[PDB]
Design a protein around this motif. Structure first.
Motif: not given
Length: 342
Positions: A289-318
């Motif tokens: 997530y990222a924030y400035k003043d009153n704006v807050w955004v939740g998303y996927d970054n370089q770290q979370s994408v790498a973790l999700k992709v490795q998760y998919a591989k470990e779960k034997r997904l397509g």
């Protein structure tokens, strides 16, 4: 390993297909062909014929091995209404099936995708079964008669096997799906957003039961072959306006949608950060997530994408998919994802 990206035709003025880094993908989708009620002679939106025709030759110039599919439907009520009308009418289903196959061949696509959100309640699932069964059979017949390689068939699915986890009215028939389809695109995002009065991780891998892992587990527990599952990862974030500028973490009170109408592209999020927003990686949810003043955004970054992709591989997904490729102009996240699986 399926490395999938969706390109929305709406984005053509700012992000034409020539801008896609197709070296980072195995499959690219054109989104979306319309159902075209009441005839259900499926078509690209009139006026977009050249864009649809040029899509596949264009992306293949950078990576000839990349394949393409055209997705029929989309999110939103009009599409859902049209699928519901279509699937109840045997004659309309026949017209849809014939025209969809013809559409793919016409523009040089290698497959078809159905984006129906969602086949519920039970009646709608039963009628969707009829459509998909007829489509599978016709796809196999076309491959035999024409002699050409069989069209791929995929569909969008909810993050969870049950529609819905909190109140089950129907569920995805996993054996049926595994037999008729090459894979499903698991929409493991939009768990949280400005419709809620607290900030949250919109695509949390884990936490709550509204998470990517819980959803994936549900398909696996029902008996889906893991290779039939493709994990969706968003190239956009969900944004909120904060009630207090000093309460900036996950679970902070919010007063409405941030820009743009509650969603920001990854590229815009990068601009947000460069313009003074603070980026935080949240290990609890595997998200950013990222924030400035009153704006807050939740998303996927370089770290979370790498973790999700490795998760998919470990779960034997397509594999994994991104919605949508125009939202990461420098292809930062498709690059890390491709490197991670490789």
């Amino acid at each position: 390993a399926l490395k999938v990206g969706f390109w929305p035709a709406y984005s053509v003025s700012e992000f034409p297909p020539s801008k896609i880094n197709s070296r980072l993908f195995t499959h690219l989708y054109y989104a979306f062909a319309e159902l075209n009620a009441p005839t259900f002679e499926v078509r690209v939106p009139p006026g977009s014929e050249k864009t649809a025709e040029d899509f596949t030759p264009t992306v293949r110039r950078l990576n000839p091995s990349v394949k393409t599919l055209i997705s029929i439907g989309g999110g939103g009520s009009e599409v859902r209404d049209n699928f519901a009308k279509l699937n109840s009418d045997a004659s309309a289903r026949q017209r849809f099936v014939k025209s969809s196959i013809a559409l793919a061949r016409r523009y040089g696509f290698h497959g078809l995708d159905l984006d129906y959100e969602y086949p519920e309640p039970q009646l709608e699932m039963e009628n969707f079964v009829k459509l998909v069964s007829e489509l599978t059979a016709a796809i196999r017949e076309e491959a035999r008669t024409s002699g050409k390689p069989r069209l791929l068939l995929t569909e969008a699915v909810y993050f969870h096997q049950k529609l819905f986890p909190w109140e089950v009215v129907t569920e995805y028939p996993v054996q049926f799906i595994a037999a008729g389809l090459d894979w499903v695109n698991v929409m493991a995002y939009d768990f949280h957003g400005s419709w809620e009065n607290f900030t949250g991780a919109p695509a949390a891998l884990r936490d709550s039961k509204f998470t990517a892992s819980v959803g994936i587990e549900s398909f696996l527990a029902a008996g889906m072959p893991p290779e039939k599952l493709v994990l969706g990862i968003p190239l956009f974030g969900r944004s909120w306006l904060l009630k207090n500028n000093n309460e900036v973490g996950i679970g902070a009170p919010a007063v409405g949608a941030g820009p743009v109408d509650g969603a920001l592209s990854f590229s815009e999020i990068q601009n947000f950060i460069r313009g003074g927003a603070r980026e935080v990686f949240d290990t609890t949810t595997v998200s950013a997530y990222a924030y400035k003043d009153n704006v807050w955004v939740g998303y996927d970054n370089q770290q979370s994408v790498a973790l999700k992709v490795q998760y998919a591989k470990e779960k034997r997904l397509g594999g994994y998919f991104f919605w949508s490729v125009n939202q990461d102009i420098d292809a930062i996240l498709p690059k890390i994802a491709s490197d991670t699986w490789g």
